């Protein structure tokens, strides 16, 4: 006869959602000064994380149903968005506009400005971007911002940051992640090289368009993950073994005028340039995107045909979704990209000040006007590829770039209760 | 941490007074208090105390059911009964308090100021 | 020699004051889109609830003491409250009006609108209600809302419902409610048959004046409650055993206008008329109201005297006290209800668009204009009587129609432990 | 052999920083009605609070390491704050005034109000204060409030009363305040007379500057305490045996009007004046104050110089730092105080309505004009000290005038787990 005996601090466990909460590295809660990612308002990063790898643990993986790009989506736009509660609002600044081509990206406008200084009325210039704004119909001198019959911009409070800040997620007591470490374990299925982990490594809150890029590498070939590979309704995301350099600037040094449109009130505009008109543009080592992209290819072809003709130009979709994105030193460039997919580097670039946190509804926030010139450089490490066997860059927001890092882990609760039949029956 | 004492008292012959001690600057409970006499021209004569927590009391044999010991916690304050005066009960009431190390008398260095009963 | 010995879970329990929690049905999950009430932060009802009949249990109860009213009160107010934040200010658009008749409940009126479009202005028209707008006086031809000069009133969001979904509402652990299954059980006073319960049944969030419906129909007999039946300080809750039809409408099958007042922001007004002018109107089987009520007399001579003449007309109070009213449709409606009580039936009904959440301070919600016509019905299940031996329709607010539901239970907080003497000491 | 035992509710601790939760006296629950501080969200006080002396006990305390002072300086000012979200922005207030003298420290200006009834303009008039308003230096008619060109100020909502409440801090469970309760005891250093305080008496919010009040008077001697007595860079806190009575006044009846500029939204500005014009002043009692500066002397000598000259006019600072500040009857009084320092007593006042918490960063507060005479007394209790042997009254801010009090305490942490080696071995 056996007996029922209670066992606790059984190593079991169920997969279970959570919330993870933050941790920061050493830096970032003195950047609260102005940035509003890497705030004050989270604890420090476990200065000596702990690993355990798991003899004959194998579980199921999928990158496509990891609910922590859902808490990822959120906590990015949740703050960013209170980071600009107490900013301006540019509503009385959509006036009217009467402008020329700067001495036509960039357009010298006047304005009249509507009553300001409590009884007075003031006449001022500013510099826009063709992208921001857009002419009236029957004037074609007179121009209003995009935006301003849908909803209220604000620009900036010219103290923030968006320094894309390495913040590591960690789990509750009670809780694991458990960490796929098959190096070539596709986006779904089965992984038996899995680890314990407490909490996970910092990943950059990245924004980009048609590009991943400063982190996470692969494992000396190219390593292509898609849903199917095979429907057309499906995307793929490529990881590169070695990164590729681009270095982006903007060599106008600009300076901006503090416009006050009431006792109280005022913004930033873009002033003079200091010097000539520069392009803005990017410098992409030709030969090693290219030499990159052949071996791209020949990871490509093992689904889709070894004499398959592949990635062609830019195509579909409005400009933001054709053209390449980056905060380059916090400035927006769109550039153009099809050099780069020329054929089955120095990209022009263009900017606009007017952006959505990947995409809002209805409302935006303005760049306030950067002084000085741009320079920045980064790492590219990966693509997102658009089905027609032709492939085209771009597609998905910023859940498929959030995914594309966090397809490594998964959450479970641990289950530490349970019972066995013994031989031995409880004494009274 | 001082003792304070009440009045003084003028009885006849077969009254009773009472006499209180407050516990200011110290735990009334976390110290046992004696009660000490000294009748004009005498040296100290000891009554008995009482534990202000238990309200536990030992008395001297000379006063068995004559002298009594009551207290009063809410207000900090313990109390010295005797009943049966007589002649011999003028003196100076004093209260005081010993160290109690290990719970057993050391000697007192707390005093109140005493107080006076006529009889 | 008895000794101390102590038990732990001990059915017992003190009355006490805690916070009830909302559980949800089903659907209201998924009806976040646009009711209010109904929201998705909300648990789900136990789809099995249970209920204890208890033996020897007789508990006093005192509908007029229980606090679950306070607790609706504040509930109610504060989620009406809270989907209003980010709706329409109609500010702007009380500036003028220069009203004739509809081609006079309903004015057809005209107006300027200041700067709207940047540096233009413009000229609009609109339906009005004379319930929401009145005249100046040394014009007789131009008109103002209401409210304007104390407070502001805004638009509710298109995008929303009042639909008063059952949502029940469920103790918190170590807390149960006690409920009066007693069917002949007054207002106040000792009940015996008591039940257990860990939640209470759905209860639909009903606005109305003069009008107890749509659930918690009487014992086959008219029961009447009220704190004394005697001081004339003291109202009579009346419930039916039987409903009584009602079958409301408003014919007029209307358009609205989205008005532009500036770029980004805009407002829905009454348009056009599609067909004639109906008058809004409710249908009340006569026979069914009137049989009813002289049932209701048959009870209520009971504290009041056999021959004593009971119901007049409505009277007192401002119209919202005096006339009936209704959301039919999420229109309001505002009946004279005065054939009902004709005599100590089809009636007529006013229309208004400013609104309060029974009552505010100040501020007031308008109901943006209702597309086609308005039809609903309704189940007529009690009244609220006023003193003058004639009683009249109406008094009270809330929190008298929150307490005519929740009379039926009170909270109580679990104490199970204690301690008793026992014959057994304690070994060592 | 000594073997390991565990002990639990070991009276050890280690200084610990926690939150202290404010305690109400009994009539500040019901205050909310007006009073900011006083709060109904607030538990009452002990009404038979504990205090245990410790017989070998002897710590160090520093008062300016005291972090109960950054809790006091964060919870009153967002308090403060809070209560002011719903009120009147002065904001188009600031648009004119055409100015004359009041029939010049007040004004009497005559003002245009920008459209205000819907399509109307009308003109008003007010009494202003020169310390709140500034002319236009081309015209010397014509002025404008002085911090209209950096923010928003905001008109205290009538309901409104900062009585400076004693409301006490308490310690969480876990925690325990210790006191220090020699009178001898500077500001650093052990303190053996020490005992446990589970919550602190209550201490008002008083705000003020150059002067201590309304408590805390020293041990039967002039008190003094310092950082050092030495640096320049650090300041003296001065205790005072005895009070001294100095009572305050405006004897001008004034009266207020309520403007409306548009439907819906007005404020009140100061009206006619009933009867004459009084200076606002304070009677101090002379012998009383220089009686006390004489002791002043005495103990202040001992750190720098028996014939030292100490004690001079007041210096250094703009004119909110020169004059003498409180708020009296909730009047904002601004006195030279010179004559109190006159020599190494009547002082006239000034009135000012725009305040700040302290001092605020751009906004800042209108304090609505009070109707009738201000009539206050007070009781000064002591002094802070400026280095320059001269020394000079004033400096500091809220948190040195909330570390005079919070000296006498610090926070610790209880740690009632341990173990220790025993001849007794673990029995199985
Ligand atoms: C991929 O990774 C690359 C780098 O590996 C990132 O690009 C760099 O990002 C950092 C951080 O945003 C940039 O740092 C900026 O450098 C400017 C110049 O630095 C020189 O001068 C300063 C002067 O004191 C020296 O301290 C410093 O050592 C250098 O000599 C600074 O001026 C910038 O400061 C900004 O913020 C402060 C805050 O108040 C302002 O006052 C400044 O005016 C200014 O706004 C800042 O420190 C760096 O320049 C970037 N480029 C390069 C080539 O490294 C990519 O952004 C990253 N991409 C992604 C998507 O992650
Ligand atoms: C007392 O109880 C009665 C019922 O017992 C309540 O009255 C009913 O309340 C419901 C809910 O408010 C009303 O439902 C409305 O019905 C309209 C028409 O329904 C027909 O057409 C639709 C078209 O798809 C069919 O699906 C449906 O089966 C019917 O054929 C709908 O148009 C209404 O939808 C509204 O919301 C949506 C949300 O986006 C909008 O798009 C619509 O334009 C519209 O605004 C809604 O579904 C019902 O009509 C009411 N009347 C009747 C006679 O049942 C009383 O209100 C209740 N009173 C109280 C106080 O509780
Ligand atoms: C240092 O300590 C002194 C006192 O020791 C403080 O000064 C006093 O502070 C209190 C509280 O602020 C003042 O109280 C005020 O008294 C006015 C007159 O009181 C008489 O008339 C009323 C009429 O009903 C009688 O009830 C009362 O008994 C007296 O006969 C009141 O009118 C004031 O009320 C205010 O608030 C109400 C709330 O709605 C308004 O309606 C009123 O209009 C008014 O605004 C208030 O009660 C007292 O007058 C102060 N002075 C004196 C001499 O005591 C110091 O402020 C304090 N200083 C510091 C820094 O702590
Ligand atoms: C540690 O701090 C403790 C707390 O302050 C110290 O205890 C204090 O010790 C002083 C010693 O003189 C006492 O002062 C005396 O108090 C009596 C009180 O009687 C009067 O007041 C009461 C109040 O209701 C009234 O009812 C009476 O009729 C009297 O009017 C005075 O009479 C004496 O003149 C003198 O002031 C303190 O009272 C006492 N504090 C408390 C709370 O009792 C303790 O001594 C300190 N220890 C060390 C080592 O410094
Ligand atoms: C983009 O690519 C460049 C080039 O590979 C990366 O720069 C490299 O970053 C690593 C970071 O560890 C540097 O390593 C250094 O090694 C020395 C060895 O003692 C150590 O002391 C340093 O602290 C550091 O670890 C490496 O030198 C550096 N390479 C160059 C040429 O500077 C860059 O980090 C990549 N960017 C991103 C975002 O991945
Ligand atoms: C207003 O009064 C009407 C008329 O009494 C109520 O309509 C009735 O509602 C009940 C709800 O249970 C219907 O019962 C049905 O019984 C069948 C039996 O198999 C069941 O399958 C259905 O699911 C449902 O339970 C009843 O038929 C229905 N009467 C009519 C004539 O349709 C109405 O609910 C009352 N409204 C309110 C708010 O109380
Ligand atoms: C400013 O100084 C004045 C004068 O010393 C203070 O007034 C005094 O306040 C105390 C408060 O306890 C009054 O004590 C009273 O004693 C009687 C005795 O039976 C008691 O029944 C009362 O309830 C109260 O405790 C004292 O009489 C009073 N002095 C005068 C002349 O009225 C005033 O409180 C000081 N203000 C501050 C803020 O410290
Ligand atoms: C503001 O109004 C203008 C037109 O008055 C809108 O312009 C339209 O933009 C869409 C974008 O694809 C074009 O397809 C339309 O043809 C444009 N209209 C015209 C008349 O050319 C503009 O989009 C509106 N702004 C916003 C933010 O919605
Ligand atoms: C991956 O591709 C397969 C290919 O068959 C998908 O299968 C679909 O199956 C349904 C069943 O009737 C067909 O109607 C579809 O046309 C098939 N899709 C295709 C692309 O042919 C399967 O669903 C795909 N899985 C994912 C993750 O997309
Ligand atoms: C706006 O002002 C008008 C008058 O200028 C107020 O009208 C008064 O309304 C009350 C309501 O019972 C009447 O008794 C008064 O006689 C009306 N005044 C006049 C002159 O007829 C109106 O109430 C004000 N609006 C608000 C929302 O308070
Ligand atoms: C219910 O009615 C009774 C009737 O007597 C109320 O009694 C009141 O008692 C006071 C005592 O002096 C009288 O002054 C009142 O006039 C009485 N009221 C009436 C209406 O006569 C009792 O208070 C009432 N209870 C409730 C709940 O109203
Ligand atoms: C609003 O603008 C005026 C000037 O246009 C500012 O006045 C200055 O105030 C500082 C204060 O110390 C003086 O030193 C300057 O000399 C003043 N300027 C002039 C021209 O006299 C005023 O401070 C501004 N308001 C705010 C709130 O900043
Ligand atoms: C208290 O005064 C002493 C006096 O010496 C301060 O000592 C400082 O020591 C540094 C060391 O090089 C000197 O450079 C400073 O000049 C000294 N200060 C003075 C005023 O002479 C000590 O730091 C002071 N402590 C506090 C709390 O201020
Ligand atoms: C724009 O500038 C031209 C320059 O001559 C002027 O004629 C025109 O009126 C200006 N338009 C506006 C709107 O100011
Ligand atoms: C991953 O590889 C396994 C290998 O059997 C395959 O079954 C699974 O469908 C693959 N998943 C994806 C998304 O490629
Ligand atoms: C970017 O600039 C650095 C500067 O040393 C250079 O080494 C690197 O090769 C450049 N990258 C490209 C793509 O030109
Ligand atoms: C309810 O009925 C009981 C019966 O005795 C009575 O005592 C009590 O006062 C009644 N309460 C009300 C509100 O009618
Ligand atoms: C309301 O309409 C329904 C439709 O069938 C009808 O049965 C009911 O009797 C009507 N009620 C009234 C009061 O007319
Ligand atoms: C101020 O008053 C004087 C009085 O004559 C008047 O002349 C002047 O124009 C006024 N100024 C303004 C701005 O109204
Ligand atoms: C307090 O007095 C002690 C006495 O030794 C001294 O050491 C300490 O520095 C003094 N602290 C201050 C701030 O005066
Ligand atoms: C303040 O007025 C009171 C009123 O009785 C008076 O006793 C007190 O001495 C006055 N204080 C001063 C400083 O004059």
């Known amino acids: 006869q056996l007996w029922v005996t209670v066992y606790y601090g059984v190593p079991v466990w169920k997969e279970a959602t959570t919330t993870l909460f933050c941790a920061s590295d050493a830096r970032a809660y003195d950047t609260e000064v102005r940035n509003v990612w890497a705030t004050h308002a989270c604890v420090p990063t476990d200065p000596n994380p702990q690993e355990v790898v798991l003899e004959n643990v194998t579980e199921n993986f999928n990158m496509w149903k990891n609910n922590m790009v859902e808490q990822m989506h959120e906590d990015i736009i949740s703050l960013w968005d209170q980071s600009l509660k107490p900013c301006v609002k540019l509503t009385p600044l959509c006036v009217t506009l009467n402008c020329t081509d700067l001495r036509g990206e960039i357009k010298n406008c006047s304005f009249n400005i509507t009553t300001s200084m409590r009884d007075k009325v003031q006449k001022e210039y500013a510099l826009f971007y063709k992208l921001d704004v857009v002419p009236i119909k029957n004037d074609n001198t007179s121009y209003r911002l995009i935006s301003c019959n849908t909803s209220v911009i604000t620009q900036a409070c010219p103290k923030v940051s968006f320094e894309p800040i390495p913040i590591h997620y960690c789990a509750p007591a009670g809780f694991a992640i458990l960490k796929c470490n098959d190096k070539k374990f596709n986006g779904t299925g089965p992984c038996t090289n899995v680890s314990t982990v407490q909490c996970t490594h910092g990943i950059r809150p990245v924004v980009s368009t048609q590009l991943l890029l400063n982190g996470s590498l692969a494992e000396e070939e190219v390593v292509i993950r898609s849903a199917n590979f095979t429907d057309n309704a499906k995307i793929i995301i490529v990881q590169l073994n070695k990164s590729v350099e681009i270095n982006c600037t903007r060599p106008n040094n600009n300076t901006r005028k503090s416009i006050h449109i009431g006792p109280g009130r005022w913004f930033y505009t873009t002033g003079e340039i200091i010097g000539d008109i520069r392009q803005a543009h990017c410098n992409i080592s030709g030969t090693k995107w290219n030499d990159t992209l052949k071996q791209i290819v020949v990871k490509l072809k093992e689904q889709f045909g070894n004499k398959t003709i592949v990635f062609n130009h830019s195509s579909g979709g409005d400009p933001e979704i054709v053209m390449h994105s980056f905060n380059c030193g916090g400035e927006f460039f769109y550039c153009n990209s099809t050099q780069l997919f020329n054929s089955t580097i120095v990209l022009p670039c263009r900017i606009k000040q007017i952006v959505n946190m990947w995409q809002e509804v209805g409302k935006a926030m303005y760049a306030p006007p950067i002084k000085g010139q741009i320079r920045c450089s980064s790492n590219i490490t990966g693509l997102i590829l658009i089905r027609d066997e032709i492939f085209r860059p771009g597609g998905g927001d910023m859940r498929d770039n959030w995914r594309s890092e966090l397809y490594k882990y998964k959450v479970v609760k641990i289950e530490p209760l349970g019972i066995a039949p013994t031989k031995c029956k409880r004494r009274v | 941490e001082v003792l304070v004492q009440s009045g003084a008292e003028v009885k006849k012959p077969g009254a009773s007074v009472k006499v209180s001690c407050r516990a200011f600057?110290?735990?009334?409970?976390?110290?046992?208090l004696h009660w000490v006499r000294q009748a004009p021209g005498q040296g100290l004569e000891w009554l008995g105390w009482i534990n202000p927590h238990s309200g536990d009391t030992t008395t001297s044999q000379k006063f068995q059911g004559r002298v009594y010991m009551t207290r009063d916690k809410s207000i900090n304050t313990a109390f010295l009964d005797v009943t049966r005066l007589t002649s011999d009960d003028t003196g100076i009431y004093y209260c005081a308090r010993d160290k109690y190390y290990g719970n057993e008398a050391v000697g007192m260095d707390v005093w109140g100021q005493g107080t006076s009963v006529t009889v | 020699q008895l000794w101390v010995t102590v038990y732990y879970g001990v059915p017992v329990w003190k009355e006490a004051t805690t916070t009830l929690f909302c559980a949800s049905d089903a659907r209201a999950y998924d009806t976040e889109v646009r009711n209010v009430w109904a929201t998705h932060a909300c648990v789900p009802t136990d789809p099995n609830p249970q209920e204890v009949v208890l033996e020897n249990v007789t508990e006093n109860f005192n509908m007029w003491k229980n606090n679950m009213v306070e607790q609706m009160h504040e509930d109610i107010i504060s989620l009406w409250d809270q989907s209003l934040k980010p709706c329409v200010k109609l500010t702007p658009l009380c500036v003028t009006l220069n009203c004739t008749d509809l081609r006079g409940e309903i004015k057809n009126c005209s107006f300027n609108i200041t700067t709207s479009m940047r540096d233009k202005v413009q000229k609009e028209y609109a339906l009005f209600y004379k319930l929401d707008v009145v005249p100046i006086k040394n014009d007789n031809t131009s008109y103002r809302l209401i409210s304007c000069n104390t407070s502001v009133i805004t638009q509710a969001c298109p995008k929303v419902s009042f639909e008063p979904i059952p949502i029940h509402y469920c103790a918190p652990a170590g807390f149960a409610i006690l409920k009066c299954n007693d069917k002949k059980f007054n207002g106040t006073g000792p009940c015996t048959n008591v039940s257990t319960v860990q939640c209470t049944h759905g209860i639909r969030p009903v606005v109305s004046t003069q009008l107890l419906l749509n659930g918690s129909l009487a014992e086959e007999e008219v029961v009447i409650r009220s704190a004394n039946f005697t001081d004339n300080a003291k109202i009579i809750i009346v419930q039916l055993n039987k409903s009584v039809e009602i079958n409301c409408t408003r014919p007029n099958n209307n358009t609205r206008k989205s008005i532009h007042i500036g770029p980004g922001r805009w407002f829905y007004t009454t348009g056009e008329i599609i067909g004639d002018i109906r008058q809004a109107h409710c249908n009340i089987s006569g026979t069914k109201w009137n049989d009813t009520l002289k049932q209701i007399v048959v009870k209520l001579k009971e504290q009041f005297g056999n021959k004593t003449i009971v119901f007049n007309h409505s009277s007192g109070g401002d119209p919202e006290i005096v006339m009936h009213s209704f959301n039919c449709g999420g229109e309001f409606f505002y009946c004279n209800s005065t054939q009902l009580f004709n005599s100590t039936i089809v009636l007529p009904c006013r229309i208004k668009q400013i609104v309060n959440m029974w009552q505010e301070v100040g501020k007031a919600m308008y109901a943006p204009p209702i597309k086609g016509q308005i039809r609903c019905s309704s189940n007529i299940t009690g009244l609220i009587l006023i003193r003058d031996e004639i009683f009249r329709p109406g008094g009270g607010d809330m929190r008298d129609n929150w307490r005519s539901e929740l009379y039926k239970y009170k909270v109580v907080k679990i104490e199970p432990l204690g301690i008793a003497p026992t014959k057994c000491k304690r070994r060592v | 052999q000594l073997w390991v035992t565990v002990y639990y509710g070991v009276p050890v601790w280690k200084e610990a920083t926690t939150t202290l939760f404010c305690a109400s006296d009994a009539r500040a629950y019901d205050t909310e009605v007006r009073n900011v501080w006083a709060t109904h969200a607030c538990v009452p006080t002990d009404p038979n609070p504990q205090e245990v002396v410790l017989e070998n006990v002897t710590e160090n305390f520093n008062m300016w390491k005291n972090n109960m002072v950054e809790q006091m300086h964060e919870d009153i000012i967002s308090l403060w704050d809070q209560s002011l979200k719903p009120c009147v922005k002065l904001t188009p207030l600031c648009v004119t005034l055409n100015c004359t003298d009041l029939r010049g420290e007040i004004k009497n200006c005559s003002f245009n109000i920008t459209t205000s009834m819907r399509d109307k303009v009308q003109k008003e008039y007010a009494l202003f204060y020169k310390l709140d308003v500034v002319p236009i230096k081309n015209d010397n008619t014509s002025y404008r409030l002085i911090s209209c060109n950096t923010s928003v100020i905001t008109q205290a909502c009538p309901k409104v009363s900062f009585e400076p409440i004693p409301i006490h801090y308490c310690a969480p469970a876990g925690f325990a305040i210790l006191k220090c309760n020699d009178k001898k005891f500077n500001g650093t250093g052990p303190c053996t007379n020490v005992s446990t305080v589970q919550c602190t008496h209550g201490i008002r919010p008083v705000v003020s500057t150059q002067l201590l009040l309304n408590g805390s008077l020293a041990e039967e001697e002039v008190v003094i305490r310092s950082a050092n007595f030495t640096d320049n860079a650090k300041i003296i806190i001065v205790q005072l045996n005895k009070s001294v009575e100095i009572n305050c006044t405006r004897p001008n009846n004034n009266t207020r009007k309520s403007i409306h500029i548009g439907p819906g939204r007005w404020f009140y500005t100061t009206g006619e004046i009933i009867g004459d014009i009084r200076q606002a002043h304070c009677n101090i009692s002379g012998t009383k104050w220089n009686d006390t500066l004489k002791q002043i002397v005495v103990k202040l000598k001992e750190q720098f110089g028996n014939k030292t000259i100490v004690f001079n006019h007041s210096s250094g600072g703009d004119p909110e730092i020169v004059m003498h500040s409180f708020n009296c009857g909730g009047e904002f009084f601004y006195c030279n105080s010179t004559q109190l320092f006159n020599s190494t007593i009547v002082l006239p006042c000034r009135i000012k309505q725009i305040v700040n918490m302290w001092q605020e960063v751009g906004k800042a507060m209108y304090a609505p004009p009070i109707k009738g005479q201000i009539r206050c007394s007070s009781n000064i209790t002591g002094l802070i000290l400026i280095r320059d042997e001269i020394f000079r009254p004033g400096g500091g801010d809220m948190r040195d005038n909330w570390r005079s009090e919070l000296y006498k305490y610090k926070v610790v942490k209880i740690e009632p787990l341990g173990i220790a080696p025993t001849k007794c071995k673990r029995r199985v």
């Open positions: 600057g110290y735990t009334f409970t976390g110290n046992a």
